[PDB]
């Protein structure tokens, strides 16, 4: 299979996920 298939899947999984988690964390810290 594509050697970049796993990398593309991983980055697709990760980047929006870390974005959303960062937004939620900097929301919840605030009152």
């Amino acid at each position: 299979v594509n050697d970049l298939g796993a990398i593309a899947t991983a980055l697709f999984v990760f980047i929006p996920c870390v974005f959303l988690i960062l937004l939620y964390a900097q929301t919840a810290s605030r009152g």
């Binding site: 299979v1 298939g5 796993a6 899947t9 991983a10 999984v13």
Partner: peptide
């Protein structure tokens, strides 16, 4: 190794279900 990618995404989905069910902020 694709199997590992599929299984990891699936396990993350199940964990998300667990947290979304038992740890949602209380509606009010």
């Amino acid at each position: 190794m694709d199997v590992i990618a599929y299984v990891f995404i699936l396990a993350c989905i199940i964990g998300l279900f667990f947290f979304a069910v038992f740890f949602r902020e209380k509606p009010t």
